């Protein structure tokens, strides 16, 4: 996509993550673990539901119309009836083709955007206590137990608490 | 000493292919189908009033071919003509058949009001072995075949005013005998004439004597015409022979009625959208079942499938 997260600096997706669309894997002293982020997941889903529901808004009801199949050859009037319907079908077919192409291009870009936004938000929580390894992982330069990890994931992590500890580890 | 926090996104083993502006195939986690491409093969009996013509065309039910008498005064939202339909009365044609069929289909009713026409000096209720009704000879129920009384057919000249607040549709015709003997034998005059008029319009038809192909016992034909008479206007019928007279008028409506050719059976379900192939659901915005539709329907497109992505790009190991 336009943001270079999905199929970009994040090498691949996780078939393992079944509880959401975006999230976190960690390794600390206490081992490994995985958890989905709800806000990012929900923002993508809401956007996709929105377009889905706009696209499937029922908006066509027609009753008496022109004839479209004919049992006899007639000439001019029939040629025009067929041409009118053929013109209409080609225009609607074009509309349907373009609609999905545009929508799908946008769906890919917005999901890529959400990945990237979560990554930048996380980097901003961590301030000077971590560094971007270049592959969608942050190297955290301090003791970060499962209470500390949970605090990053839920938006409460206070960077001052660990700044001294981590500034030391970064420049030594 | 330190920790790692890795950001990622989900993926699935079972991806779906979609098109974009740049790629004609790319795998996403999920997608939904926007083209309805199938039907159960049945026309749902609700919520639209469906009238199955069975063996009868709409025109034959209008005119009143005896095997179509069950359709007298019928109404419909959608009239269904079957390919097995057949005529079994006097052989006829309708100049501009398609237009009469259309206007009647669209009116949505065969409500017929008999009026007290006076046909002075002629024999009424003519019939033919071509149009059996019970065991004996007969005719179209809504038409009145006039012939000589004794040895004369006088100039008929009648009026019927529209004092109602709706439009009246009159169906009438002209008989085209196969020989001069037949002509004179039925109408006395060597050449007939029918003039039907209102204040606004006039039609004059001259019959044409000659053989046509033998169909259901007859080389002769009837040609069917129609006249609409608006509130406050008047019908005048003038003929010195060959008039197939109206018995009254059909009541005209405007509304959402139509007609469809189909051999699909009618069954018990609910569907807003009807095609000749059967009813189809209308949750999707497009359909590839049939360009002919009635009701709240997806729009017909040429593609049999169009997938809308409902998830991100699927990137597995
Ligand atoms: C055949 O039938 C038609 C319809 O009944 C006849 O038309 C009528 O002809 C008379 C004249 O003989 C018209 O009379 C005029 O009526 C107006 C009323 O507005 C009056 O002001 C005049 O002084 C005059 O009396 C009559 O209006 C007309 N009827 C209609 C409905 O227009 C026709 O005369 C008949 N023809 C034959 C040859 O029998
Ligand atoms: C709906 O019915 C029509 C026929 O009444 C089907 O259309 C035909 O399809 C084949 C190609 O698969 C062609 O040989 C015919 O010429 C088509 N007819 C017309 C008028 O286009 C159609 O396949 C049916 N669709 C479904 C889903 O049942
Ligand atoms: C994905 O789409 C299909 C139908 O197109 C739907 O039935 C299914 O529930 C959806 N699954 C998810 C996980 O969104
Ligand atoms: C048709 O409708 C009219 C009233 O609108 C009625 O007088 C007439 O008898 C009906 N005919 C039949 C055959 O049901």
Swiss-Prot record, chain B:
Which cysteines are disulphide-bonded?
Answer: 44-269, 56-68, 89-131, 273-297
Q: Where would I find glycosylation on this chain?
A: 14, 30, 73, 157, 277
Q: Superkingdom of this entry's organism?
A: Viruses
Q: Which residues lie on this side of the membrane: Extracellular?
A: 3-317
What name has this protein been given in UniProt? Hemagglutinin HA1 chain
Provenance organism:
Influenza A virus (strain A/Hong Kong/1/1968 H3N2)
Name the lineage: Viruses, Riboviria, Orthornavirae, Negarnaviricota, Polyploviricotina
Entire protein: which part is shown?
A: 27 to 341 of 566
